[PDB]
Each structure stands twice: as structure tokens, then as C-alpha cells.
Design a protein around this nucleic acid. Structure first.
Ligand SMILES: Nc1ncnc2c1ncn2[C@@H]1O[C@H](COP(=O)(O)OP(=O)(O)NP(=O)(O)O)[C@@H](O)[C@H]1O
Ligand SMILES: Nc1ncnc2c1ncn2[C@@H]1O[C@H](COP(=O)(O)OP(=O)(O)NP(=O)(O)O)[C@@H](O)[C@H]1O
Ligand SMILES: [Mg+2]
Ligand SMILES: [Mg+2]
Lengths: 246, 239
RNA sequence: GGCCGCCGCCACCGGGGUGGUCCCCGGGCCGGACGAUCCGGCGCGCCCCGAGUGGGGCGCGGGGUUCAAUUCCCCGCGGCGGCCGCCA
RNA sequence: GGCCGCCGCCACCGGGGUGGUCCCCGGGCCGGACUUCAGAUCCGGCGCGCCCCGAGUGGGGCGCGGGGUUCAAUUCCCCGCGGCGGCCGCCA
């Protein structure tokens, strides 16, 4: 069906650009997609202020969440922390939708250069620190491993990428658990095991004979799971008797 | 406090531009303000589709709503219908905040000119019809009356506008027994008048009789409906 | 990136049990005796034996307890995860 | 923009009620009743208009937009004037 696309990468690596191109392709593919990012709101404020961020984070997540109920969502954001990427995944987990992390990278070189061409709104010094404190996706959690790693300096086959994503959208997202396909059959197993250990201690057996006692139980148990009705007490005696006449 | 500023005007009249300016000024005035408009989300879609509108509307209102809890909010939208403007007011009504409608005007001429300059993404034909069906703010409801009417063709004193708004933000947003005796006695009198067909002079007395009785009772502290109503009926029968 | 938790380190995969030199359930695969069925088996390393096919022995991160450790204790490696680090 | 509607025209202001000649509740003011002052108390009252009497100061008549159902209209109905709203129309 539809899925959540999480982007991750340092400022200026080309995330927003990426989003719009990827978004157009996906459209041509008859896929309703929307690009959401914290900036949408953050930049709706004439000025920036630390106190705004709480609201911004909350407002952004709400959009993604409500948007993910009906459309493909490409999250255009830094997500330089893994716990952020997690938060975004829990949204897809919540609506049981497939999710794909796309990590865009580029050498600090290209980043500093592009930031200078932007007026250096964000001090080069910051860009440098972020590059260092950035959480390499996949390095800590397997759920964090990137479905793709894109190098914005080289070409990009948006058609191939769109193809791969669509195919993953069709897969089954197993976020938590499943079952595929008793007590008495089990109690006989456990008990016979203890009985065999008792017999082995009372006869001070050697390696050779013990292996027969073990095979003796194996044969015994096989003969029993063939019989329909069985009683713990009864069987356990037939076993002890079998061991005594060994 | 903080208030909800509603913008209204045809596409290209200068709404978004207006918002950014008004927001900057309000900022220097130590006021936390945010600019929100349906376009924010609509344009987050690579292409446009009728079915997106529902989400776009709902998602936008949610933002304005959650934003108006902590910040001033300038709604940058066309809102060419009054029912739309109302729906935004209901938000301010909900949080009991002041609201100010700002109508941006411009001759069809300036609009068509500006639309051409934008690539005419919106066919001129459309701009023309929207102009012909733009609900003139105030024309139907007093609550719709514009706090201001701005002509984007002439200059704009953002400092003056900012001052007026601030001042309006400070204004205040607006948004038994004795009775039962009166009612019943009235009924009793109508009943008595039906069962005896009195004369003009006579009924005038019955009415003055109730008048005097009622006055005598509003003097007594404790009273019981059932009880007094009986004393009245008895007084009626003994006259 | 910091803190902490669960698990694996018995050897086809998954799940589970267990002081027995492993075992049970499901799946897969291989071989032998007879075509389905019956029976046996399954990884890596090292060593011995056989002209060869093949057969057999030893071991399974380090150490402790024990007749015996996959299991129980301490340590080491690894797998997975949780919380938080939040325009940067 | 389309469709539907509410309130006032009882009379200090606002809300409301009720076929009883009006009233109920809150506000404001004026005055009477207990003051040097001030938070308070109970109680009478409060608008508009046309005509007349004060040979002086005040009081008297009647009406409360037009008509109808009525013994009685503030109330119920039709219209007028005055004030206000609801739903919907939705990139456009
Ligand atoms: N594939 C690309 N190759 C070269 N330059 C690119 C590419 N994509 C984007 N750019 C340019 O790199 C600069 C930043 O791109 P942008 O998409 O804004 O990055 P971003 O990560 O979204 N930035 P930010 O939102 O601040 O984190 C602009 O000059 C883009 O035009
Ligand atoms: N005060 C102004 N005087 C003259 N031109 C203006 C003014 N304000 C804005 N413009 C120009 O008018 C064009 C559109 O302005 P814009 O602010 O986008 O209007 P809008 O109503 O927000 N448009 P839309 O979002 O499509 O409804 C741009 O060229 C603006 O620069
Ligand atoms: Mg960006
Ligand atoms: Mg605009």
C-alpha cells in the first residue's frame, strides 16, 4: 500500500531538493505523496526562538501522523539523532505502514561550500560540529539501517529509487511478532530427562553406556507420540521399568 | 494578550507579502506571531488534486488552532467566503481571543496584471470570476466587518497597523418562585373570568384584586407556590 | 554519543527444554534399504587410520564447580533492543 | 451569493418571562430612611409624545408604528421601521 519515507542528513546535503524530485517521480507513478518537514512551520515564524521548537516538533509530528493515514509521506529533515528517526518510525509502526530510511551524505567539503553559497545562515562552525555529532544511521540499531545511502555529489536515478520504494511498499511490515503452524507431551520429555539423570548417577555409568540410555529415551519418546491417548503417571512407569530392565 | 488576525482577499492582492511584513513588525514589538495559510500544506504536494483539499483544510485549521493557544496568528488565506471567515472566528471564539479581519483590496486590473507576472498559473478567467463572487466582508454580518481595509496599490504604514492591532488585543472579547406566582395567578384570573363572564367594571376589579394580592405577598419572606395559589383562588371565590 | 537491559557462543534454519557427552516440536536438506515408506544423518577446525571411496578420535571464546556444562557461577566476544542526548 | 430565521417597538440600560391592563432577575442613577467618610441596608421612583389647566410653582387627559383574533395584547397573527444571526455555497 503506502509508506513512510524518512530522510536523514546534514543541512544543505540536498534533502529538500531530493524530496521534491522523489515526490514528482512517485506522482508519475500514481502515488499520492506529501513532503513534510519541521521547517514548514519553523519558517512560518518571522524570527527563530528556542521556545518555538517544542511547538514546532509537536506540530510537525502531528502533520506526519495525520498525513500518513492517507498518503505517502517523505519526511524532509535532518534527523541527525537516531532517537528522532525512531520517533518517526513509531508513527509508521502505529499505523502499521512500511518505512524506508534514506541517508543522504556528502563530504564536509561540499557541505561547507553549499552553506557559504546560502549566506552562511548557519555558521560554518555549526555545520562542522553537526557532521561530527551526527548519528550514522544503522550503526546502533538494525531498525535504523538505511534502505538507501545516496551521494548528492553524484548522479541520482530517481526512477530506480522510485521503483525500489514501490516494491518495498508491497512487502509486509512485521514490526513486532507472529505465530506459525502440548503440556503433557512436554512433561514426559522433562521427566524422562530427570529420570535418566537419576539412573546415570546410581550406576556411575561411563560415556559409552550413557549414550545408550540417551538413545533409549529417544526411542521411547518416539514410540509414545504415536499413541493417541496417554497418561503421565502410566508412561513414566513404563519408562522407569524399561530403564531397570536395561 | 494574543489575537487571531484573519486576512482576506483575492489571489495575488499581496496577502503573503502583507503577512511577512506585519509579522516582522509585530516581532519588533515583542510579540510572538506565526503566519499560517492553507497553501503551506497544499504546496507540500507535488501536484494538485481535489481530494487533497479535505486534508488540506483540516490540517490547516488544526495548525491555526494549536498555534492560537500560544501565539498570535495571521491567517494568510483568500477566505473569499464569509462562512470560511466564520470558521476561523470560531477558533478565536473557542480560545476566547480577540480577532481582527483585514481585507486586502485591489482593482481587477492590478490583479490580472500581477497574475500574468506570476506565469498565470491560475487562469485569468478564474481570477475574474473569483472577483465577481468574492464575499465583500461585512456586507452580510456585523461580525464579518473588517478591522481594516487595505489597498495594496498605495503605501502601507505597518507601524500604524501594528499599533492598532496591539491596542485591540488589549480590549475585552465578549462573545423563580416569585415568577411562578405571577404566572399562575394570571392563569387563575383567566379561568375565573371565563366561568363568570363579568362586566367591564367588574373584571377591572378582579385584576386590581390580583395586583393588590401580589403586592401583599412579595412582602412576606417565606412562601410556597401551592399554598399562596390556594389563598388566591379562595380570595377569588369570595368576591 | 552516554547509560542500561535481554539473548547467542551445541555445531542446517526457527522455536523451545535441560547437569547426560544433548533433547523436543515444525521446516529444509542428504544418504542407505528398499517407487511412496522404514531407517540413519547434517557446521567449522585439528589429528589418526585406509592405495582411494570412506571410517574414526579431539575440540567448539577464557576459567570455576562437577563423574559429566549447551545448561549453573565469574570473565570475554558478538546479536538485538530500551531510555535519553532535540533549530545545531 | 442562495435558502431560513431571531430580537425590540412596556416606557432608565441589559437578559428573560407571561393573553391580566404587566412582571421576573442583574446594571445605573435619584431620593427617602440611621450619620464625621465610606463598603452596606430596606424602601418609592425613573422614557417618549400630543393637548389642556399653573393668570404663580405642578398636575390632568390620552397615546406608545398601522390593522386583526380578545373582555384584556408586552405577549398570538399580517405588514413597517429599527437591530442581529444561522446553515450552506470550499484550490477557484
Ligand atoms: N543533487 C544535488 N547536487 C548538487 N547540488 C544539489 C543537489 N541537490 C541539492 N543541491 C543544492 O544544495 C544546496 C542545498 O540543498 P537543500 O535541498 O536545500 O538541502 P537540505 O538538506 O534540504 N537543507 P536544509 O533544509 O537546510 O537541511 C542548494 O544549492 C541545492 O540546490
Ligand atoms: N504592497 C504591494 N504593492 C505592490 N505589489 C505587491 C505588494 N505586495 C505584494 N505585491 C506583489 O503582488 C504579487 C503577489 O503577492 P502575494 O503576497 O503573493 O499575494 P497573495 O494574495 O499572497 N497571493 P496568493 O497566495 O496566490 O493568494 C507579487 O509580485 C508581490 O510582490
Ligand atoms: Mg531542506
Ligand atoms: Mg499568498
Amino acid at each position: 500500500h503506502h509508506m513512510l519515507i524518512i530522510l536523514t542528513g546534514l543541512p544543505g546535503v540536498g534533502k529538500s531538493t531530493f524530496s521534491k524530485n522523489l515526490a514528482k517521480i512517485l506522482s508519475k507513478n500514481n502515488i499520492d505523496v506529501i513532503v513534510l518537514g519541521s521547517d514548514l512551520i519553523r519558517e512560518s515564524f518571522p524570527v527563530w526562538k528556542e521556545k518555538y521548537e517544542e511547538f514546532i516538533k509537536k506540530s510537525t509530528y502531528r502533520l506526519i501522523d495525520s498525513a500518513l493515514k492517507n498518503y505517502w509521506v517523505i519526511v524532509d529533515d535532518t534527523n541527525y539523532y537516531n532517537s528522532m528517526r525512531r520517533d518517526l518510525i513509531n508513527i509508521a509502526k502505529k499505523y502499521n505502514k512500511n518505512y524506508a530510511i534514506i541517508y543522504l551524505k556528502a563530504s564536509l567539503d561540499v557541505l561547507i561550500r553549499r552553506n557559504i553559497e546560502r549566506g552562511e545562515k548557519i555558521p560554518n562552525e555549526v555545520i562542522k560540529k553537526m557532521y561530527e555529532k551526527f548519528d550514522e544511521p544503522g550503526k546502533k540499531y538494525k531498525w535504523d539501517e538505511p534502505f538507501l545511502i545516496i551521494d548528492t555529489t553524484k548522479d541520482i536515478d530517481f526512477n530506480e529509487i522510485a521503483k525500489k520504494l514501490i516494491e518495498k511498499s508491497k512487502e509486509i511490515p512485521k514490526f513486532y511478532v507472529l505465530e506459525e503452524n502440548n503440556n503433557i507431551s512436554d512433561k514426559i520429555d522433562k521427566e524422562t530427562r530427570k529420570i535418566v539423570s537419576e539412573y546415570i548417577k546410581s550406576k556411575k555409568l561411563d560415556k559409552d553406556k550413557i549414550k545408550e540410555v540417551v538413545e533409549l529415551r529417544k526411542e521411547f519418546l518416539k514410540k509414545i507420540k504415536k499413541m493417541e491417548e496417554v497418561d503421565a503417571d502410566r508412561v513414566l512407569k513404563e519408562f522407569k521399568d524399561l530403564l531397570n530392565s536395561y
